[PDB]
Amino acid sequence: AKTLLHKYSDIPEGTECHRKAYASTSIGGATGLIVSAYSIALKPPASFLEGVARTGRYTFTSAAIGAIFGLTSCISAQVREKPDDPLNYFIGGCAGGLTLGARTRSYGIGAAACAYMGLTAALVKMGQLEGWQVFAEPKV
Amino acid sequence: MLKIIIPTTMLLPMTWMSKHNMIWINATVHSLLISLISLSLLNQLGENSLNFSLTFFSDSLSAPLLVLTTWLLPLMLMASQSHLSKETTTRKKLYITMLILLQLFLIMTFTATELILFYILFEATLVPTLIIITRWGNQTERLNAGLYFLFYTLAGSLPLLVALVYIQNTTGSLNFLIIHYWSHPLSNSWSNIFMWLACIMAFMVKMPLYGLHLWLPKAHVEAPIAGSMVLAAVLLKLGGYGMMRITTILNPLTNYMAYPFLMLSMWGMIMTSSICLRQTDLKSLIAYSSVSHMALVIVAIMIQTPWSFMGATALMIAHGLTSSMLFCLANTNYERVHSRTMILARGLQTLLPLMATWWLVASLTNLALPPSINLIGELFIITASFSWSNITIILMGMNMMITALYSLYMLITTQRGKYTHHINNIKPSFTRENALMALHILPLLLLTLNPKMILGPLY
Amino acid sequence: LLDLIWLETILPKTTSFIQMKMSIMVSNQKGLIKLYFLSFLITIMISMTLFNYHE
Amino acid sequence: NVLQIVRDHWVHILVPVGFVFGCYLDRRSDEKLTAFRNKSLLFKRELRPNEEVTWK
Amino acid sequence: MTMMSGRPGRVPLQFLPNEARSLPPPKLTDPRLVYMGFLGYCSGLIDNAIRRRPVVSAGLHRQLLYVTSFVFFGYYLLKRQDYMYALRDHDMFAYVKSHPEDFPEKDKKTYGEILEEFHPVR
Amino acid sequence: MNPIIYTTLIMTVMSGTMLVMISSHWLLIWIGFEMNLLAMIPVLMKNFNPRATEAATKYFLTQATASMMLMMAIIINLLYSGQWTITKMFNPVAMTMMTMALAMKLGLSPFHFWVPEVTQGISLQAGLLLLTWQKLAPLSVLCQISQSINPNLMLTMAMLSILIGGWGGLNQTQLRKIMAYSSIAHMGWMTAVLPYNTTMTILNLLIYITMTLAMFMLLIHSSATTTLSLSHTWNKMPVITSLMMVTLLSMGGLPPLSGFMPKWMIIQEMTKNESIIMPTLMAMTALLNLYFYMRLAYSSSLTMFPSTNNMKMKWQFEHTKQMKLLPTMIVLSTLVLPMTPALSSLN
Amino acid sequence: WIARTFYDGPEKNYEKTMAILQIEAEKAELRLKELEVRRLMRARGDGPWYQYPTIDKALIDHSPKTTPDN
Amino acid sequence: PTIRLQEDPDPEDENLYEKNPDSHGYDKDPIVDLWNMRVVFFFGFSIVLVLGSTFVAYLPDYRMQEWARREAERLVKYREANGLPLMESNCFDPNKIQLPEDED
Amino acid sequence: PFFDVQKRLGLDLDRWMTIQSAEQPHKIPGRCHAFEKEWIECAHGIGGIRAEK
Numbered sequence A: 001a002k003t004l005l006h007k008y009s010d011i012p013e014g015t016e017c018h019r020k021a022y023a024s025t026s027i028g029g030a031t032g033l034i035v036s037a038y039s040i041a042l043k044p045p046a047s048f049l050e051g052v053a054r055t056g057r058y059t060f061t062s063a064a065i066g067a068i069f070g071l072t073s074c075i076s077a078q079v080r081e082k083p084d085d086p087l088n089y090f091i092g093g094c095a096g097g098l099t100l101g102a103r104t105r106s107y108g109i110g111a112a113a114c115a116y117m118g119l120t121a122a123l124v125k126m127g128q129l130e131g132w133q134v135f136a137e138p139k140v
Numbered sequence B: 001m002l003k004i005i006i007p008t009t010m011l012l013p014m015t016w017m018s019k020h021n022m023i024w025i026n027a028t029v030h031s032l033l034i035s036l037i038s039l040s041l042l043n044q045l046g047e048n049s050l051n052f053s054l055t056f057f058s059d060s061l062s063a064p065l066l067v068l069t070t071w072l073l074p075l076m077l078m079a080s081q082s083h084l085s086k087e088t089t090t091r092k093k094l095y096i097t098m099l100i101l102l103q104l105f106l107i108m109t110f111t112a113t114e115l116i117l118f119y120i121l122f123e124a125t126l127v128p129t130l131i132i133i134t135r136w137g138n139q140t141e142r143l144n145a146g147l148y149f150l151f152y153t154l155a156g157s158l159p160l161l162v163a164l165v166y167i168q169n170t171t172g173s174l175n176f177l178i179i180h181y182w183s184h185p186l187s188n189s190w191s192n193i194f195m196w197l198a199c200i201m202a203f204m205v206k207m208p209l210y211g212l213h214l215w216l217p218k219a220h221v222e223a224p225i226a227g228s229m230v231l232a233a234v235l236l237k238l239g240g241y242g243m244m245r246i247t248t249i250l251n252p253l254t255n256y257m258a259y260p261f262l263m264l265s266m267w268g269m270i271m272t273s274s275i276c277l278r279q280t281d282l283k284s285l286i287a288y289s290s291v292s293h294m295a296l297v298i299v300a301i302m303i304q305t306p307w308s309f310m311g312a313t314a315l316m317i318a319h320g321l322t323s324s325m326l327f328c329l330a331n332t333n334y335e336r337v338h339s340r341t342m343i344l345a346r347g348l349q350t351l352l353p354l355m356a357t358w359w360l361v362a363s364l365t366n367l368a369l370p371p372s373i374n375l376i377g378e379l380f381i382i383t384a385s386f387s388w389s390n391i392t393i394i395l396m397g398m399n400m401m402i403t404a405l406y407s408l409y410m411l412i413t414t415q416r417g418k419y420t421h422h423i424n425n426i427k428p429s430f431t432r433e434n435a436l437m438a439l440h441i442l443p444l445l446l447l448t449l450n451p452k453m454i455l456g457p458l459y
Numbered sequence C: 001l002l003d004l005i006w007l008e009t010i011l012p013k014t015t016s017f018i019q020m021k022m023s024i025m026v027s028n029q030k031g032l033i034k035l036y037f038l039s040f041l042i043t044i045m046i047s048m049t050l051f052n053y054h055e
Numbered sequence D: 001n002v003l004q005i006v007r008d009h010w011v012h013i014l015v016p017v018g019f020v021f022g023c024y025l026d027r028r029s030d031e032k033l034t035a036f037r038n039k040s041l042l043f044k045r046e047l048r049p050n051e052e053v054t055w056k
Numbered sequence E: 001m002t003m004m005s006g007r008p009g010r011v012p013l014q015f016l017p018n019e020a021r022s023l024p025p026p027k028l029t030d031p032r033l034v035y036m037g038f039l040g041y042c043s044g045l046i047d048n049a050i051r052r053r054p055v056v057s058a059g060l061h062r063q064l065l066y067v068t069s070f071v072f073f074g075y076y077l078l079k080r081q082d083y084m085y086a087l088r089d090h091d092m093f094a095y096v097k098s099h100p101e102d103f104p105e106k107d108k109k110t111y112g113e114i115l116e117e118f119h120p121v122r
Numbered sequence F: 001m002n003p004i005i006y007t008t009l010i011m012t013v014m015s016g017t018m019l020v021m022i023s024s025h026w027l028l029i030w031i032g033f034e035m036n037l038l039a040m041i042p043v044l045m046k047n048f049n050p051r052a053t054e055a056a057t058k059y060f061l062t063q064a065t066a067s068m069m070l071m072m073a074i075i076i077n078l079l080y081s082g083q084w085t086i087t088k089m090f091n092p093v094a095m096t097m098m099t100m101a102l103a104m105k106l107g108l109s110p111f112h113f114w115v116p117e118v119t120q121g122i123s124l125q126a127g128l129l130l131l132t133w134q135k136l137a138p139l140s141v142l143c144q145i146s147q148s149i150n151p152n153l154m155l156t157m158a159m160l161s162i163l164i165g166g167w168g169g170l171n172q173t174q175l176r177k178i179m180a181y182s183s184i185a186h187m188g189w190m191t192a193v194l195p196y197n198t199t200m201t202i203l204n205l206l207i208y209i210t211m212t213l214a215m216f217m218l219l220i221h222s223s224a225t226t227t228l229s230l231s232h233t234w235n236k237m238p239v240i241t242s243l244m245m246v247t248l249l250s251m252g253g254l255p256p257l258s259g260f261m262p263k264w265m266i267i268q269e270m271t272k273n274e275s276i277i278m279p280t281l282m283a284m285t286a287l288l289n290l291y292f293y294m295r296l297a298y299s300s301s302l303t304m305f306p307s308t309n310n311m312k313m314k315w316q317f318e319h320t321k322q323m324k325l326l327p328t329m330i331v332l333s334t335l336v337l338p339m340t341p342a343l344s345s346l347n
Numbered sequence G: 001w002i003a004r005t006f007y008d009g010p011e012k013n014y015e016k017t018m019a020i021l022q023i024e025a026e027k028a029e030l031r032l033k034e035l036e037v038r039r040l041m042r043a044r045g046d047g048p049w050y051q052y053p054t055i056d057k058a059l060i061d062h063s064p065k066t067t068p069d070n
Numbered sequence H: 001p002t003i004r005l006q007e008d009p010d011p012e013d014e015n016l017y018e019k020n021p022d023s024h025g026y027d028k029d030p031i032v033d034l035w036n037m038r039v040v041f042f043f044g045f046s047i048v049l050v051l052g053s054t055f056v057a058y059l060p061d062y063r064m065q066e067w068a069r070r071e072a073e074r075l076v077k078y079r080e081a082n083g084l085p086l087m088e089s090n091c092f093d094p095n096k097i098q099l100p101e102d103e104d
Numbered sequence I: 001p002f003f004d005v006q007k008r009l010g011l012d013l014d015r016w017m018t019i020q021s022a023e024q025p026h027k028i029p030g031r032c033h034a035f036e037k038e039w040i041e042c043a044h045g046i047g048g049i050r051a052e053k
């Protein structure tokens, strides 16, 4: 929901890193839960316990990625004393990518995920700065 | 300029209604006549362009490109009829139709007054090229080459369209004259940075830029001779034309957004020149030489000085002619021995003397021997770069060496040494091939005589 | 090292690999209405909660 | 005997006809942009005693 | 978003209102009409080709009917398109005339009094 | 089946669509949808076999669920305002449910799974009908209630449709499945611009219908339902394969062909509002549809596959049935771009 | 001779360029004005464009209703 | 059959000099080949090349090089006669330029 | 989308049932006849956008 997104975004950038990490963990957990729900729906796991294990795996992976991203991004923002800089989000995104690589235990996944997640997080920070809209309201 | 466009549209039904044994003759004659007519576009002014109507106009940068396209069509017609002898009449007419359609699209591309019509035609040139490569290529790899030719281009050009229409909603026009007269500076923001990248990446991939060039060896090696000729001579120059056009609205961002592209271009001309030294394929060597020369052109355009622009235009024209000649020269040997390996047939100066003369002239022109227009463009670019930064003379100097090496290397391996013993099917050169080489080479020296015609609007 | 391996690895080979894996993911369905009707139910609930609850 | 010659070489007028038609169309397009004929601050002038328009 | 569906006074299925007669008809030498005729001719050629007949000379009455039908439809299509653009311009000009506050004309400035930054290229 | 009965069923399908498109009362729109589905089910089963029966069952289940949701949305809207006229739909929950129902009817992702199955399970004529005529009524209703559409849900489903259409079509060797995934992608393209301009939706629908008709008529002319069966056609009728390649290139969206006109215009409309990122994603994704069109063109027209001996007999015979509208459909599908401004007559 | 036979004077191209420039500038101004007018019409809904249908008042029955208070 | 398919054998390449010792490399028909050679050599070398070079060489001076040279000669003569500076650092007259009022 | 055949032909195929303030049998009034009548008369001819405010 947008309640979680507002919970994350209401806290300023370089302040209260633990709260921001908690909000990012909530977002990641929700995303992993949705992914596991769709995966179980389309690919049944053949027993209840295997489905529970898969759901726990997916949710834990996504929540860890989100928590690491939020913590690293906030700590970088506060240490460098440079809020409104996409580099902090890039560092957090690559930290999340390396977390995903460690979780799946693959070096190629780790490298590609770090690069792409850092780029995407930096892009999102840029859009927050300049007011880019993904879903533009009809205007003309 | 409908006086040039309509005769090609009439080339179409003339080709499709000619007798089965007169298609080549009629096509060649009327293409040559159209080239003669298009030669009248060189009467340019020193202040503004020739605005024929609301849709078409000509500058001093596009007129030599149009003349080059019109002159190139008959050359491909002559070089094509050798290996298409066993083909049926309808397929031969379809081949000539593909060439004519490509010429028509390029002619209308080089003279569109609006950026969106330019975009439409500069994508429309993709279809005949893909059909030619994937249908009349020789080896199995052609299919893959076609794919590499297609998406590499489209992945670059689809963002551009977006930017283009976005610009139309903010400035209210895409007409080039209005765009030039109402130009405004670009602020330092992320939105402007991504607009710059979207406007620039299509023409960067078309040149191609180093790191974005993997499609070029495939496309230029797996294509037929006419396909390779038109790919190297004209289609690579669309990126240069487009970038020299579009850079009018990107200042002063380029002042710092050219740095990664300048670095890529310089180190990549070094890398591709070094790659050319170890190449067992004769066509791949020519492809990588094209890459190096286009890297020089990219540097020239990114510097954004008048001398660099003049050098870029001259190098574009000269490289087109030289690369087309080299491809034809390699294709003669391929048609003889049915192999592209460079060390297979050796000592061909002993067996084919006049073709050895053509090889020597083409190799000398490639390595920028003065006073060829290749050298003029290269030297103008080097001087502008030295004004930009004094250390560039290192890297450019390096290139000026390596080029010559591989150039002579090719010559020495294909013409010199002792002939291969077991090859005994090497027939004397036909009149067609000799005329092809002569018609490639003589305009180069004629342009050397009067080089102001190809120095662009900055002259 | 550069042209034949890594410049190939980054742009075209990675793109083809990702597209092929995604296509395998999307198109490899058993054709059982039970599974994707359960997917329909999940989608309906998610959209009623996400987009509709926020008006 | 000119029938066979005509049927075998009548396609040799298509391109020249296209060229003259293109010249005509260029002139026609030129005819539609005369809003400033003899009106520019640089080329404005008094008409010759016999002529009608400065350019066609 | 439907801009012109609810414009007052629009008859539902007219395709050509009476006000459209206040506009000049397209000339029969319109390049768009000639392009429509060319489309009809190409359709006739493709029809001959698919049926395995001499493509150029098989059916002249059929090709004539193709060209005639395409030109006939194109004439009215062009009429309606021109009318709709005329209506758009009429509404736009009326709205600009009726809301002066939203469309002010500010004082013009010559380039001798506007300070533009200079960015050297070097 | 009796030809008279078939003609009556086709008329009933068309009458239901027209009833949806001319009605002003919500109950009559629902009645039109019901009539259309009722008459459409027998047509899918015209050639009886287990696959046609399975396709009809899946189609019926999906459309019945969608109709249920549509009626519940109408009843909720009536509850919160005593209105029966098709208008702004004064309640947001009702509009969400209406959007989902019309999406499930259209086949937009994630309600997309049924389209490849149903298209593969029926004949080429039934597939032509299903992928061309069945898109009219839901898009008409969506156009009529466009001003109250929630942009986020609509755009999310359109983007999902484009992505899934590309990825799914990448993996297919069956022509009908390729057509189904192409239809999903084009549905996404039509629905993406719907909240901003319905005229662009109508224009995209017209172009897509023309191209789909040409494609299916070419496939019927050369009775091929697989890639390898289509690869034999060059040895029998090369003109059909050539026109097929041109139409496939047009469908891919390449200029100067007419298939480029809708996307182009749609992109412009989105950039008239702010909406920059979404058109970029759509074009980059439509590259995938272009990829598998190009692979089909490779297999069928640009190369020659090995043939069979018995094909010699086929050389002595001509096509008996002839599609009279095929040349006009091909021409409209390829050479119509210079006639772009005529879209002004669409609004 | 070449100039006399094949080419015209500079004033022709000069004034044709002037006419083309005027037409293009007018088109650009019209495009921007149309965008602004569309934005205002969609925001306010007080013009001919973006007029969405409402219920017809001719459908109302102005008769005694078997109860005095409707 | 230990094969995969029925196929024609790969044919040898045809030598155009075998049936026509003077073959010009254009076509296997001697007459059409000879006329192809003639038309190429005439329309390429005689018409486009030489006449095109002659046409380009004598193109009228539309870039205004001699015009600009004469105008510059007049200007230098005038300013040298009056002792004025030969070139002025300001291209636009400052009297027609209005600067911003305050620089502080 | 919407082909207004009723309005073009003056047919009234389904407009008689759309609102609760429209000629009920035996003149039986709706529960909110006055309110719906007033709202319809307020919003008549001014468009949905202006009506909503």
Ligand SMILES: CCCCCCCCCCCCCCCCCC(=O)OC[C@H](COP(=O)([O-])OCC(O)COP(=O)([O-])OC[C@@H](COC(=O)CCCCCCCCCCCCCCCCC)OC(=O)CCCCCCCCCCCCCCCCC)OC(=O)CCCCCCCCCCCCCCCCC
Residues within 6 Å of the ligand: A105, A106, A107, A108, A109, A111, A114, A115, B210, B211, C002, C006, C007, C010
């Ligand atoms: C356009 C022009 C041309 C450009 C295009 C072409 C050139 C660019 C692209 C080509 C090169 C980039 C490739 C990226 C890495 C590829 C990995 C891969 O494909 O995985 C599949 C492949 C499959 O693995 P698997 O099947 O999953 O498992 C079986 C393993 O093989 C079994 O593995 P194992 O048992 O042998 O042990 C593996 C283990 C241990 O590895 C070993 O066994 C031997 C030790 C080698 C480790 C090397 C690091 C220590 C020395 C480095 C010294 C400093 C670096 C140079 C900077 C100097 C500054 C002046 O590795 C690790 O533990 C990794 C932990 C982290 C250490 C390495 C990370 C260093 C990152 C560099 C940061 C630079 C920041 C910017 C600097 C700015 C100033 C220049 O993974 C590998 O096997 C490779 C393992 C080594 C990966 C790390 C190598 C670092 C290379 C430099 C990266 C920087 C470029 C990217 C930057 C952009 C990102 C934002």
Ligand SMILES: CCCCCCCCCCCCCCCCCC(=O)OC[C@H](COP(=O)([O-])OCC(O)COP(=O)([O-])OC[C@@H](COC(=O)CCCCCCCCCCCCCCCCC)OC(=O)CCCCCCCCCCCCCCCCC)OC(=O)CCCCCCCCCCCCCCCCC
Residues within 6 Å of the ligand: B009, B013, B016, B090, B091, B094, B097, B101, B104, B127, B128, B131, B135, D013, D014, D017, E042, E045, E046, E049, E053, E054, E055, E056, F238, F239, F242, F243, F245, F246, F256, F257, F301, F302, F334, F335
């Ligand atoms: C942009 C500016 C203008 C350009 C507009 C666009 C281009 C032109 C318009 C397009 C449509 C026009 C033609 C459509 C009908 C063609 C159907 C056909 O099969 O042709 C066979 C037919 C020859 O067959 P035949 O004579 O019955 O006997 C031979 C056997 O049938 C032996 O036949 P077969 O079937 O046994 O042979 C098999 C062969 C046969 O397969 C084919 O014939 C392929 C033809 C495909 C038709 C094009 C598709 C629909 C149009 C879309 C074009 C899009 C262009 C945009 C860019 C994309 C590039 C493709 O198939 C293959 O070998 C497979 C090869 C695979 C290659 C892949 C390339 C395919 C696409 C090529 C399309 C290029 C554009 C059209 C070129 C014209 C073609 C005739 O061609 C013709 O002779 C008719 C064409 C010329 C008639 C018009 C002449 C005008 C009247 C003269 C006076 C001019 C007035 C001047 C005014 C002032 C007075 C002085």
Ligand SMILES: CCCCCCCCCCCCCCCCC[C@@H](O)O[C@H](CO[C@H](O)CCCCCCCCCCCCCCC)COP(=O)(O)OCC[N+](C)(C)C
Residues within 6 Å of the ligand: B036, B037, B038, B039, B040, D023, D027, G003, G004, G005, G006, G007, G008, H047, H051, H052, H054, H055
């Ligand atoms: C005299 C010797 C020394 C000098 C030699 C000079 C050589 C120059 C001659 C060569 C011609 C060069 C190319 C000509 C291109 C011109 C194309 C076009 O731009 O010109 C048109 C003019 O058209 C002319 O008719 C050009 C026709 C020339 C075409 C060349 C064909 C020759 C082919 C050779 C065949 C020889 C026999 C073949 C037997 C097989 C302009 O149309 P127009 O609308 O008026 O312009 C208005 C300007 N006005 C007002 C001043 C009139």
Ligand SMILES: CCCCCCCCCCCCCCCCC[C@@H](O)O[C@H](CO[C@H](O)CCCCCCCCCCCCCCC)COP(=O)(O)OCC[N+](C)(C)C
Residues within 6 Å of the ligand: A085, A086, A087, A090, A119, A122, B188, B189, B190, B193, B209, B210, B211, B212, B257, B260, B261, B264
């Ligand atoms: C293989 C070859 C293919 C072609 C490659 C094309 C190359 C494209 C590269 C684009 C060039 C520049 C892009 C962005 C401009 C500046 C980059 C950045 O490093 O500069 C600093 C930016 O600071 C930080 O670096 C923030 C960016 C960090 C995140 C960006 C991701 C970079 C990681 C490398 C990814 C590789 C990209 C290519 C993938 C293939 C400037 O500091 P700042 O003053 O604050 O920003 C100026 C803009 N302002 C004024 C609006 C504020």
Ligand SMILES: CCCCCCCCCCCCCCCCC[C@@H](O)O[C@H](CO[C@H](O)CCCCCCCCCCCCCCC)COP(=O)(O)OCC[N+](C)(C)C
Residues within 6 Å of the ligand: B039, B064, B065, B067, B068, B071, B317, B443, B446, B447, B449, B450, B454, H048, H049, H052, H053, H054, H056, H057, H058
């Ligand atoms: C096989 C035998 C080889 C050896 C034997 C050689 C025999 C001797 C012949 C060689 C002569 C030596 C050359 C010396 C130069 C003299 C010619 C020169 O004077 O003419 C130039 C003139 O030449 C032309 O300017 C250049 C030729 C035109 C080039 C156009 C190419 C033709 C188009 C064909 C297609 C083009 C394809 C490429 C697209 C761009 C002068 O230029 P310019 O300073 O002004 O003249 C001032 C006076 N004007 C202005 C009144 C004329």
Ligand SMILES: CCCCCCCC/C=C\CCCCCCCC(=O)O[C@H](COC(=O)CCCCCCC/C=C/CCCCCCCC)COP(=O)(O)OCCN
Residues within 6 Å of the ligand: A123, A130, A131, A132, A133, B151, B152, B153, B155, B156, B157, B159, B162, B163, B166, B190, B191, B192, B194, B195, B197, B198, B201, B202, B205, F274, F275, F276, F277, F280
């Ligand atoms: C084969 C490889 C070819 C490479 C080509 C692809 C690279 C293209 C470069 C990026 C293109 C995306 C830009 C889209 C068009 C931008 C036009 C524009 O001006 O929009 C900006 C906005 O710019 C954006 O929105 C762009 C957001 C980014 C979305 C897409 C990101 C694409 C991936 C980024 C990394 C790739 C870039 C470098 C690639 C180098 C080549 C490999 C203005 O928007 P406003 O809303 O009006 O802002 C003012 C009000 N606040």
